[PDB]
Structure formats: C-alpha cells, structure tokens
Amino acid sequence: VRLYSCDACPHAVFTTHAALLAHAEEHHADLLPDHARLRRIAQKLNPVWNRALNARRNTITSWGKKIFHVAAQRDAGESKMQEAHRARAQLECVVRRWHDKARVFIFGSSVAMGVWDGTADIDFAVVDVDAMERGSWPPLEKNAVRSITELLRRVGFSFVNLEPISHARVPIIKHHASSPDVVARSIRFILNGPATREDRLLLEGSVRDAVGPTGVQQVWWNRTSDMMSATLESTTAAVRAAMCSPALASASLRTKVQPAHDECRPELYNIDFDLSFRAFGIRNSTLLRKYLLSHPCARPGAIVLKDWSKTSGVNNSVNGYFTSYAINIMWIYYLVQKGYVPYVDPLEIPESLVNYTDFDPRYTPMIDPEITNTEREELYKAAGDMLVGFFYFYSFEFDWGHNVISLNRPGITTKRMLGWHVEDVHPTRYELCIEDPYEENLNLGRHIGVTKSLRVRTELYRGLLSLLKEG
Ligand SMILES: O=c1ccn([C@@H]2O[C@H](COP(=O)(O)NP(=O)(O)OP(=O)(O)O)[C@@H](O)[C@H]2O)c(=O)[nH]1
Ligand SMILES: [Mg+2]
Ligand SMILES: [Zn+2]
C-alpha cells in the first residue's frame, strides 16, 4: 500500500493506482481528450490482432518502405560525414591552444546512427583523458566556456553565431551557423602597421611551422605590407594556420586573423554544434551505436520514432516529456525483449577513454548498397512489422504499472528492484519508468506524472492504429 498523487491538481491523493487513473480520466479529460476513445478502438483490435496484421499486411509493408525512405534522407553519404570529421579536427586545433592535452570527441546522433545529414547539430566533448583518469576533469567549466569562446572569436567566429552558456547546469558553448574550393582554405592576417622584410619572413615561418611542409600552398602580401594572405592545403590546415602565434621582430607589431571570405569558410564555421567538457555522452552514444547496428532495421526505426515522438509531443524534454535519447532506449528495449537484437551489457562499453579510437564517428550506410531487390523487400516487410510491434508492445504488452524499461539487465526490471515502486509525495515520478544505463537512480520519465503519462499512452495507441491504415 502507498500514496499516489495527481499531477494536474494539488489536492488529489489516493491509496490505489486504479483510483489515481480514474481520477485522471474523470477530472482531467481536458488534458487527455483522446485517451479513452483511442484506447477503446485499439482494444477492439486486440482480440483479432493476428487477423488485422494479416489483412493489413500490404499496408504494413508499405509503411516499411516509407520508413527506409525517411531513414535514407538522414544518410547524406560518407563525404558529408567527413565534413563533420574535419570540423572536429579544426575545433581540436582551437581548444589545444587553451589546454594542450584536451582532445575533441564527437558524440550524439552521428555516433549512434553512423550517418550525418549535414544539418543536425553535432555534439562535441572536449576532454583531457589523462586528467579524467586522475579524477581531475573537467576544470571549472564557466572559465573553460569563456576561454574557448574568446579563442573562437579570435580565429574569426562572430558573436552573432557564438552563444557561450557559462551559467547553465552544464556550461556549454552553442554555435548557431548562419545560412548562406581555394577561398574556404584561405586566411588573411591584418597587421596594425607595416611589416619589415624580417617581420614578413617571421609571420610566414609561423604559418609554415603550424601546418608543416605540405600545408602552405601560397602566401601573398598587399602593397603596404600590412596584410598577408595565405592559401593552405586544406580547410583544416587553414584553421591550424589561423591558430599560429606569430612572434614578429618589430616592437608592438600585432596581427588579427580570419578566413579570407565571410561566407565561404572551413567546416567548423558552417555547422550547428554544442561544445561541452564532460564525457558522459560518449559512453551513451557508443552503447546506442552497438545496439542500433545490430539489426538492419534498427536505425531506420529509431529515426522514424524520433520524428514521430516529436510531432506527437511525447518527445519534448523542456516540458518534462521524453528526450530523443529516451525514445531510443524504448525502441532498443523492445528490440531486446522481442529478440530482434542481442542484449549488450552497458558495462561492456568502457568508462575509460584511454583506448578510444573513434574520435571521428565511423560511417555506416543506412542500407547495404549491394543488396538485391528481394532482400530489400524483406527489409521493408520487417521494418513495418517491427514498428507496428513497437506500438503494440507498449500499448498492450509492456507492464507500465510494475516494470521498468531498462537495458541494465536482460530480463525484466521491476520498479521495486530500483526502489521506484513508491513515490516521495513536483515529485520525482515513477509512472512511466526508463532506467538510464549509466546514471543510477535516474528515471528518464521522472517529470511525467499521471495526466502526462496518459497523453503518452494516447500517442502510443494513435501510432498503433496509424500503421494499419493509409495514414
Ligand atoms: O538524458 C540524456 C540525453 C542525452 N544524452 C546524450 O546526448 C546525446 C544526444 O541526445 P539527444 O536527446 O539530444 N538526441 P539528438 O539526436 O541530438 O536529437 P534532438 O532531440 O534533436 O536533440 C545522447 O546520445 C547521449 O549521448 C544523455 O547522455 N542523457
Ligand atoms: Mg540533441
Ligand atoms: Zn487531479
């Protein structure tokens, strides 16, 4: 026996879950207007579910085809992924000026999905692995945000694009890219006075030393010897050269540097990114990658569910619903429990970054470029079956009342196992429970109280019904 409280009014507490649910329906139908109705329609299909699957088999397969189409749009090919790799290397040049031993790791979707569409923002983590191993990373993050922001400004980033968020719970730098080849890898040094012949040789030497013996293609000075332009071998070498620290001969002669053109620039200038100083997302993303690569329909399904969850409102973290990360866990848990993919113990992914190699996320095509039409049709059928199965699983099979969506063990996780079978009554909620793989006692559904939970259940019924029809 325990207390249950409503999340839509301050004065409703009950001693049974049934009474809580009844109260949500009876007193807050305005907050969950479609729940009863969609549940009822879905409940009609349950007794004849296999017959429904059989009759709607063509439609389900067509949804499978659409799922792969949507997934294909997010796969912009290996060359596009390598643009992100180059941006990562450019950012690394910059942050090493602040802390020589820091390295840049990409995490998030390009790791988990093995593809990048060229528009999704990129997550960068900046970590000194030695320091992390000593228990001394990150340094004070507010200062790190400010230091790196200044370095980016000095290499040519505008305050219009750079958002330092030094006073957040996790301080980050957000880069907001504006919307709109030799120029892109060219830079310009502006001097505050005329350079002597010796000064000119020293600046060129500084650039040469920064990029190595192949890095500089061309250097030229203006008439008044107070601007030097350089074309480098790559966009990455261009950032590396911009990061040099010239030591000139003339007293007080100084330089400012920026890309030669305001719009045509190295990759880092052109991509939305969040820059953080913590390693947490790396292990996360690597675990998701391992699971999602283990069935050919896993990534396409995850992609369609991310979009579905956003449009249906169940993925909306600022208002306390799920994150895209949590939706990925729901999908993967379903794949594991139904036997579509093998279980992976979260502990199999090392916490330590000492042996890390994949700073640049490995590219894997969304669909095998060399499969037959027959194999492809089998994939569409499977994808449709699996997506329908996901909505069915969470609508009728998964015990939301007593169990937890968890990848921390291969068998059932009960709420009681985690101590989530009782709430301390904006409480931490245990209505819908998803265990975070690496952060113990964190429910990804902790902000989802009873009425919010029924909005979620509404959308699961809606998705189930949608896949059986023209949509
Ligand atoms: O609760 C969380 C959320 C996110 N993450 C980490 O952040 C990464 C991105 O999590 P995300 O929810 O931002 N996924 P994303 O593809 O960027 O979609 P969007 O909703 O458009 O932003 C995940 O892959 C994890 O590595 C966590 O570690 N914990
Ligand atoms: Mg994100
Ligand atoms: Zn209430």
From Swiss-Prot:
Binding sites annotated in the UniProt record for Mg(2+): 121, 123
Binding site for RNA: 169
Site keyed Important for catalytic activity: positions: 274
Residue span of motif Nucleotide recognition motif (NRM): 434-443
Residues binding Zn(2+), per UniProt: 6, 9, 23, 28
Compartment(s) where it occurs, according to its Swiss-Prot or TrEMBL record: Mitochondrion
Consequence of gene disruption: RNAi-mediated knockdown at the procyclic stage causes severe growth defect and a severe reduction in mRNA editing. Reduced production of guided RNAs (gRNA) and rRNAs due to a block in the processing of gRNA and rRNA precursors. Accumulation of unprocessed precursors for some pre-edited and never-edited mRNAs.
Positions of C2H2-type zinc fingers: 1-32
Binding locations of UTP: 109, 120-123, 281-285, 306, 310, 324-325
Span of domain PAP-associated: 177-226
Entry similarity comment: Belongs to the DNA polymerase type-B-like family.
Swiss-Prot/TrEMBL domain comment: The C2H2-type zinc finger domain is required for the proper folding of the catalytic domain, but is dispensable for uridylation of single strand RNA substrate.
Biological role stated in the UniProt entry: Terminal uridylyltransferase which is involved in the post-transcriptional editing of mitochondrial RNA, a process involving the addition and deletion of uridine (U) nucleotides in the pre-RNA. Specifically, catalyzes the addition of Us to the 3'-hydroxyl group of guided RNA (gRNA), ribosomal RNA (rRNA) and some mRNAs. As part of the mitochondrial 3' processome (MPsome), catalyzes the primary 3' uridylation of gRNA precursors to facilitate their recognition and to induce their processive 3'-5' degradation by DSS1, and the secondary 3' uridylation of mature gRNAs.
Quaternary structure (record): Oligomer. Component of the mitochondrial 3' processome (MPsome) complex composed at least of terminal uridylyltransferase KRET1/TUT1, 3'-5' exonuclease DSS1, MPSS1, MPSS2 and MPSS3. Within the complex, interacts with DSS1, MPSS1 and MPSS3.
Name used for this protein in its record: Terminal uridylyltransferase 1
Organism: Trypanosoma brucei brucei
Portion held of the full protein: 190 to 689 of 976
